[PDB]
Amino acid sequence: MNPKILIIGACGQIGTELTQKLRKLYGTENVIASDIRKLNTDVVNSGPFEVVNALDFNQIEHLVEVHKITDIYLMAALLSATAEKNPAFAWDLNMNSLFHVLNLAKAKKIKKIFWPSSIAVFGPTTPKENTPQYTIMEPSTVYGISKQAGERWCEYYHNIYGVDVRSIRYPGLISWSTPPGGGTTDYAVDIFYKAIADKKYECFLSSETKMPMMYMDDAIDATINIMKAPVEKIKIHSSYNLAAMSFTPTEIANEIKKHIPEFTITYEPDFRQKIADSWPASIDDSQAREDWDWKHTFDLESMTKDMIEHLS
Amino acid sequence: MNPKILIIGACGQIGTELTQKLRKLYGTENVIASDIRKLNTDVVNSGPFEVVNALDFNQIEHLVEVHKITDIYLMAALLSATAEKNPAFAWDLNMNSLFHVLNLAKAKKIKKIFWPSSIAVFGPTTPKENTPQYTIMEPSTVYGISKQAGERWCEYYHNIYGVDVRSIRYPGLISWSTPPGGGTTDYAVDIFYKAIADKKYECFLSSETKMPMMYMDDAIDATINIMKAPVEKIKIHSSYNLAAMSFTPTEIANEIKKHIPEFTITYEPDFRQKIADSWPASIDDSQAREDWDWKHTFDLESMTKDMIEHLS
Ligand SMILES: NC(=O)c1ccc[n+]([C@@H]2O[C@H](COP(=O)([O-])OP(=O)(O)OC[C@H]3O[C@@H](n4cnc5c(N)ncnc54)[C@H](O)[C@@H]3O)[C@@H](O)[C@H]2O)c1
Numbered sequence: 001m002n003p004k005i006l007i008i009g010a011c012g013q014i015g016t017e018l019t020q021k022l023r024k025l026y027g028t029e030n031v032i033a034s035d036i037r038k039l040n041t042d043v044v045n046s047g048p049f050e051v052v053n054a055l056d057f058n059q060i061e062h063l064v065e066v067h068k069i070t071d072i073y074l075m076a077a078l079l080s081a082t083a084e085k086n087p088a089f090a091w092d093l094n095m096n097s098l099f100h101v102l103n104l105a106k107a108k109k110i111k112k113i114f115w116p117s118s119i120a121v122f123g124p125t126t127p128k129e130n131t132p133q134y135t136i137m138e139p140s141t142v143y144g145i146s147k148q149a150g151e152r153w154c155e156y157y158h159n160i161y162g163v164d165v166r167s168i169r170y171p172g173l174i175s176w177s178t179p180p181g182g183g184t185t186d187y188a189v190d191i192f193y194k195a196i197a198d199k200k201y202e203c204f205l206s207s208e209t210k211m212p213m214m215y216m217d218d219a220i221d222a223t224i225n226i227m228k229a230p231v232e233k234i235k236i237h238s239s240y241n242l243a244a245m246s247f248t249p250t251e252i253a254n255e256i257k258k259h260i261p262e263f264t265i266t267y268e269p270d271f272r273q274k275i276a277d278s279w280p281a282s283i284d285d286s287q288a289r290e291d292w293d294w295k296h297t298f299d300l301e302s303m304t305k306d307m308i309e310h311l312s
Numbered sequence: 313m314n315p316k317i318l319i320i321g322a323c324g325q326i327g328t329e330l331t332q333k334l335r336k337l338y339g340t341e342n343v344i345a346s347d348i349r350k351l352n353t354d355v356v357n358s359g360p361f362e363v364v365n366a367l368d369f370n371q372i373e374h375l376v377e378v379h380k381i382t383d384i385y386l387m388a389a390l391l392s393a394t395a396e397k398n399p400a401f402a403w404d405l406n407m408n409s410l411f412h413v414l415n416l417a418k419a420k421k422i423k424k425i426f427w428p429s430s431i432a433v434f435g436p437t438t439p440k441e442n443t444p445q446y447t448i449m450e451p452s453t454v455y456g457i458s459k460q461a462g463e464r465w466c467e468y469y470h471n472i473y474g475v476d477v478r479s480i481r482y483p484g485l486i487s488w489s490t491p492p493g494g495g496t497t498d499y500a501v502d503i504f505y506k507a508i509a510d511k512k513y514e515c516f517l518s519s520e521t522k523m524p525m526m527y528m529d530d531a532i533d534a535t536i537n538i539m540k541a542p543v544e545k546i547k548i549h550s551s552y553n554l555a556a557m558s559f560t561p562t563e564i565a566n567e568i569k570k571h572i573p574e575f576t577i578t579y580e581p582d583f584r585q586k587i588a589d590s591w592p593a594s595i596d597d598s599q600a601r602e603d604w605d606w607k608h609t610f611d612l613e614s615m616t617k618d619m620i621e622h623l624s
């Protein structure tokens with residue numbers, strides 16, 4: 001029997017693609033999209049959609065019951081940069097939405113959970129190159145703190161209540177279908193829109209800020225694959241390191257220049273630079289590849305090509 | 313001026329001795345003791361006392377105003393063992409009482425904060441001998457998770473809002489004046505009461521469970537000293553590793569046997585063993601010794617002697 005999926009925060013940068021891919025694999029009506037915002041987007045009209053506030057346990061419980069949900073992908077949360085502008089609300093949403101979904105699993109109302117963490121769980125004291133799965137983690141942002149506590153609780157619920165909750169620490173994600181939600185790595189998306197539209201871009205991070213990145217297609221495959229994998233293959237119950245690429249603004253701008261020779265870029269770092277400087281440059285995701293066969297397909301060159309094709 | 317102190321959770325194992333010492337150093341009326349419980353204890357009757365619920369922000373704010381408080385020692389929380397019995401309430405109390413005190417500082421209603429963390433912040437993947445100040449931390453208990461998130465928020469409030477909050481990761485504490493509140497290291501206190509009262513003890517931890525311990529006298533000295541130090545000497549804004557002793561039940565039992573020859577001990581480990589097994593055996597507190605000159609005074613021998621003198 002195919003699972004009955006509920007995607008919370010389906011209108012987001014990831015949710016948009018995740019919902020589409022899941023519907024292709026398991027059927028349009030087997031995947032219910034939900035979000036607090038209901039826009040005339042493609043995801044809302046291309047299948048069952050439900051307005052929901054992930055902050056309200058009763059609203060989620062109700063959708064689980066009326067749509068007989070077995071799997072929940074909790075994507076709703078405020079991102080790294082946005083969360084700094086409203087610490088209180090970010091902590092509230094990011095933590096309590098997770099507690100609601102975890103409690104639904106604890107009560108046996110759902111069977112499986114996917115909840116993404118982020119490379120934001122790492123801090124200034126975390127090794128910057130090939131960051132290990134198990135290492136120092138002292139996040140300096142509200143967002144990172146919420147993701148770290150989230151990981152701790154996911155592991156707790158698994159170990160103590162037997163909840164099947166799976167997670168991955170997505171690096172900075174890049175996509176063409178929906179605008180980012182205010183992460184610190186959003187420049188890797190913006191640069192494409194401005195390069196194509198204005199043929200120039202003003203980057204909010206300094207030129208040599210090396211960071212872990214991943215094309216959305218890869219992020220989606222990772223999400224689906226860890227969830228469809230047999231339970232005995234999920235050996236880490238906090239969150240899996242996940243990697244694909246690592247590059248600086250100079251490098252991605254140079255790759256774009258191969259497609260748009262006249263493209264120019266200037267650098268005007270803002271508060272987001274301080275967040276980036278507290279994160280690693282590259283990630284070691286060996287446990288993910290070993291435990292459930294994770295493998296990325298896009299590198300800087302293939303992603304740049306695919307982005308430009310989609311946007312021009 | 314001398315500080316006007318408010319101790320929240322003043323009737324606890326640490327609070328009892330902390331309130332006494334602070335009153336000796338700064339004056340009886342300059343130290344306000346508060347707790348949700350008001351017993352016929354020596355704490356309540358030895359100076360100004362206020363009933364308070366640390367979970368209620370307005371109640372704390374009112375005491376801060378009516379007593380013109382400058383410093384707050386937030387001791388109220390549920391301990392490692394007790395927290396496992398009520399995860400939801402433990403998370404609520406431990407986290408929100410801290411947010412209230414941190415927010416009072418953010419609003420500049422108070423000047424300084426002392427909030428204790430614990431060795432419980434460490435986990436199964438944490439090096440067990442001479443645990444470094446900066447290391448892997450994956451707490452497997454609700455208590456440990458609350459202390460870890462607490463440390464992250466203390467650092468955040470300091471770094472972003474300039475709040476002067478100081479913390480130390482107390483190892484297992486041993487005292488003679490007030491019973492422990494349900495920690496995993498409580499056997500180190502119970503063994504004395506049972507050795508003296510019945511000359512026999514049934515330990516809830518296996519004989520070779522080596523853990524980081526500290527006599528209350530040292531823990532109090534550490535608390536007051538880190539708070540008395542000039543602000544520039546406080547270089548770590550999360551929480552300081554703090555050490556004194558490390559020993560197994562076999563060793564402390566042998567030390568007691570020197571004073572009570574007929575003392576016998578048997579081992580009947582319970583759920584608390586699983587908690588202890590996830591913690592380190594010894595702690596490396598050099599940052600504390602070098603930043604603010606931490607120096608412990610009691611070792612197993614001197615502590616055992618002092619405990620027996622107090623209890624018999
Ligand atoms: N995009 C990335 O580079 C990245 C990196 C690492 C981790 N993540 C994690 O992936 C998840 C999704 O990220 P995204 O980039 O798709 O974010 P997004 O901001 O683009 O999408 C978030 C969605 O959640 C919805 N939402 C907000 N509050 C809600 C509420 N109260 N109830 C219901 N829905 C609500 C929003 O309307 C939005 O459609 C988040 O947990 C994020 O932390 C993302």
Ligand SMILES: NC(=O)c1ccc[n+]([C@@H]2O[C@H](COP(=O)([O-])OP(=O)(O)OC[C@H]3O[C@@H](n4cnc5c(N)ncnc54)[C@H](O)[C@@H]3O)[C@@H](O)[C@H]2O)c1
Binds near residue numbers: 365
């Ligand atoms: N004793 C130890 O070995 C140890 C070790 C590491 C860290 N710590 C930390 O030190 C602090 C004090 O610990 P303790 O051993 O004194 O614990 P304890 O249980 O003996 O004392 C806690 C006190 O807080 C009070 N309290 C509980 N809820 C309250 C609320 N809602 N409002 C106001 N007061 C409330 C209790 O009545 C009690 O008097 C805690 O943060 C603890 O986690 C203790």
